[PDB]
């Protein structure tokens, strides 16, 4: 059906924009995008999120042309390298897709708008984790890696905490976006 093909478009570009928002929030300076009443056919989810080609390339190589699903989740690992070379996993942003589907949605445009709000929640949450205050004063250098898991957080050290940025139900299952930080 074309409906779930468009749904695959929405999941794909939502994942790409997720990586964009996270990496750009760890970029070391303030982000600023202007609004437009006459937009372009590239403003996904009614949000001005300028794609930076290097991280779209890395993200696509991590996705290998696939989408998240049950047992297959996309992760963005934000880590730190110092002068001595100590590597620490500071954040693991997880984009899970569980099994519970919901048929009561017209996947037409409700999923699109709620995914838009999920990207807005991601925008707000990416600035209240301690790794943001770290990455703004950057000495230190921040690194990112996108990988398709099989998520595990053993490299976070005991005592991590998880913030949930939100969930969005779809006829193929509910999407969850959260972060596990040190």
């Amino acid at each position: 059906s074309q409906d779930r093909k468009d749904l695959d478009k929405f999941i794909k570009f939502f994942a790409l924009k997720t990586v964009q928002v996270i990496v750009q929030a760890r970029l070391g300076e303030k982000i600023c995008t202007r609004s437009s009443s006459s937009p372009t056919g590239s403003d996904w989810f009614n949000l001005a999120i300028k794609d930076i080609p290097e991280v779209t390339h890395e993200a696509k190589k991590a996705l290998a042309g696939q989408l998240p699903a049950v047992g297959r989740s996309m992760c963005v690992e934000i880590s730190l390298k110092t002068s001595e070379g100590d590597s620490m996993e500071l954040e693991i942003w997880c984009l899970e897709m569980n099994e519970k589907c919901d048929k009561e949605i017209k996947v037409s445009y409700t999923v699109y708008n709620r995914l838009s709000l999920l990207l807005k929640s991601l925008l707000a949450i990416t600035r209240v984790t301690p790794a943001y205050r770290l990455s703004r004063k950057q000495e230190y250098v921040i690194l990112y890696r996108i990988y398709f898991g099989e998520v595990q957080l053993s490299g976070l050290g005991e005592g991590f905490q998880t913030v949930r940025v939100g969930t969005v139900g779809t006829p193929v299952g509910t999407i969850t976006l959260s972060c596990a930080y040190r």
Binding site: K30, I31, C32, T33, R34, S35, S36, S37, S38, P39, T40, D43, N46, L47, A48, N113, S116, L117, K120, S121, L123, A124, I125, R127, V128, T129, Y132, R133, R136, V163, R164, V165, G166, T167
Partner: protein, 207 residues
């Protein structure tokens, strides 16, 4: 569509009172807005693109994301300015609070006017603390920032437990749901009032 209410409390310095409120208002308005609708004669509409920008706090060790609309920024800073004035001229009490109310507009038959039904309301209660030394200031900045982190996280975690939102309108009733007055955004119909509170005592029950 009965009303949903939430409460936030932050203990801040008098200087921090404006930045703390702007951070809460803007994050809530970020989720409670969309791009401007441009309508076609047929009834279809196109949705504009919402911009975002970061604001670094001066009196707080904190950063928050607001929508790039400048008219909304000035509009919010004005009313939070009225709050900041009223609380200073209320003196020893120092216990105030603002309320952000999102409401729908319902048509009424003559002679009655349109009834504004609230569907979501946000209350933020301010506790102002007096300061003396400077080394207490430099710590109040940090701890206030770290509290606002918890507050923003909680707001986001609520913007998901609230499933209900008013239905998307047609071209005629678009002003029964949205504030279409801004040229950069189309936020939901909102009303921002504040109130200075008289402190009340605590009962001696489970204590």
């Amino acid at each position: 569509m009965n009303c949903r209410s939430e409460v936030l409390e932050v203990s801040v310095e008098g200087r921090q009172v404006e930045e703390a409120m702007l951070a809460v208002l803007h994050t809530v308005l970020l989720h409670r807005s969309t791009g401007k609708f441009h309508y076609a004669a047929a009834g279809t509409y196109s949705i504009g693109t919402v911009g975002t920008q970061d604001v670094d706090c001066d009196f707080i060790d904190f950063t928050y994301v607001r929508v790039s609309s400048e008219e909304l920024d000035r509009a919010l800073r004005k009313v939070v300015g009225e709050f900041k004035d009223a609380l200073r001229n209320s003196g020893g009490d120092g216990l105030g609070q603002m309320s952000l109310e999102f409401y729908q507009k319902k048509k009424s038959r003559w002679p009655f006017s349109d009834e504004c039904i609230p569907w979501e309301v946000w209350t933020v209660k301010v506790h102002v603390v007096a300061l003396a030394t400077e080394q207490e200031r430099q710590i109040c900045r940090e701890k206030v920032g770290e509290k606002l982190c918890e507050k923003i996280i909680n707001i986001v975690e609520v913007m998901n437990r609230h499933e209900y939102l008013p239905k998307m309108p047609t071209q005629s009733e678009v002003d029964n749901v949205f504030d279409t007055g801004l040229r950069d955004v189309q936020p939901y119909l909102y009303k921002i009032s504040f109130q200075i509170t008289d402190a009340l005592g605590t009962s001696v029950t489970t204590t």
